[PDB]
Design a protein around this ligand. Structure first.
Ligand SMILES: CC(C)(Cc1ccccc1)c1cc2ccccc2c2nccn12
Ligand SMILES: CC(C)(Cc1ccccc1)c1cc2ccccc2c2nccn12
Length: 301
């Protein structure tokens, strides 16, 4: 991991970056802020290119669509909590998702949104904004504190609160046992495995494939080719993560690197060519009057 660039928020006594994702335009990173702005930066010069006030509370998550035309955001206490934005010509709001505190696109065909409200997942149509499905079974809930509902790479399975759902049937297929308080899991991009905290489960057999202790309390991100997995660990404006991230081979789950950047991490993401890792790092503690985050770009890569 060679450092390539660093920048702080412009136009600001203190720097309030909270989350990031590369745009569909190469060289440009999208970042959310603690005042609910979405900004576009040149990742090498550190130049702010554009700004929009998406929310009147801190941005906690964003996801751009692959084709460049849409963006999801989630805020902190604002109503609506999550929204979908169009970014063709004029930046505008298309839909909002009133009490969903987290939202993702579908993966194969990005025509749906999946939102999380506590233990409950909601699936929405992008065009109409309509709620198509609610996935929730009170007998199967794990009540994970950092529940994030997510589609599998083919958009036909959902993981919500440690429960595997079939989207077409709207039926729970399997409940994975609860082995931690917080992390609910993701799908591996191979379509065959799920990573729930320290457990890797096979989707065809439900056997345990691997135990990876170093994934405890880690938010997992994959690079775009699906060969490397990045883990940032939840903290014991408070940072969501501690100051180290871990990388693993995505095919055999063997450790590649432990990087302690010595600053609490707010977010990390890779570009679509997997040359770079962008990391939001806090120069301040949570005791500071104000936030002072930087975006650091590392070549992996
Ligand atoms: C859609 C567009 C006009 C594109 C554009 C405009 C100027 C420079 C580069 C790209 C635009 C995009 C955007 C993306 C993220 C955060 C804010 C904005 C934003 N705020 C008002 C304008 N925009
Ligand atoms: C809760 C989460 C979505 C991170 C997460 C944790 C566990 C499981 C999945 C996802 C998140 C929270 C937050 C709160 C304050 C400021 C920035 C952020 C922020 N920036 C990128 C993500 N976040």
């Amino acid at each position: 991991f060679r450092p390539i660039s660093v920048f702080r928020e412009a136009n600001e006594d203190e720097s309030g970056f909270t989350c990031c994702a590369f745009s569909a335009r190469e060289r440009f990173l999208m970042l959310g802020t603690c005042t609910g702005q979405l900004k576009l930066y040149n990742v090498f010069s550190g130049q702010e290119e554009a700004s929009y006030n998406c929310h009147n509370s801190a941005i906690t998550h964003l996801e751009p669509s692959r084709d460049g035309s849409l963006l999801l955001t989630s805020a902190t206490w604002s109503q609506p909590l999550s929204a979908l934005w169009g970014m063709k010509s004029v930046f505008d709001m298309k839909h909002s998702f009133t009490e969903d505190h987290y939202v993702e696109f579908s993966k194969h065909s990005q025509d749906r949104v999946i939102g999380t409200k506590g233990d409950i997942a909601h699936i929405y149509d992008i065009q109409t904004g309509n709620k198509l499905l609610t996935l929730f079974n009170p007998d199967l809930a794990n009540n994970y504190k950092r529940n994030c509902a997510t589609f599998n790479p083919t958009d036909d399975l959902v993981l919500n609160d440690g429960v595997l759902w079939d989207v077409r049937s709207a039926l729970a297929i399997h409940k994975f046992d609860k082995f931690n308080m917080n992390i609910s899991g993701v799908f591996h991009p191979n379509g065959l495995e799920v990573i729930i905290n320290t457990e890797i489960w096979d989707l065809r057999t439900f056997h345990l494939l691997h135990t990876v202790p170093a994934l405890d309390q880690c938010r997992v991100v994959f690079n775009h080719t699906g060969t490397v997995m990045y883990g940032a660990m939840l903290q014991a404006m408070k940072s969501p993560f501690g100051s180290s991230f871990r990388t693993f081979n995505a095919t055999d789950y063997k450790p590649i690197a432990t990087i302690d950047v010595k600053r609490n991490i707010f977010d990390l993401c890779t570009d679509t060519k997997d040359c770079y890792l962008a990391v939001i790092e806090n120069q301040g503690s949570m005791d500071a009057l104000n936030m002072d985050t930087v975006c650091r770009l590392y070549e992996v890569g």
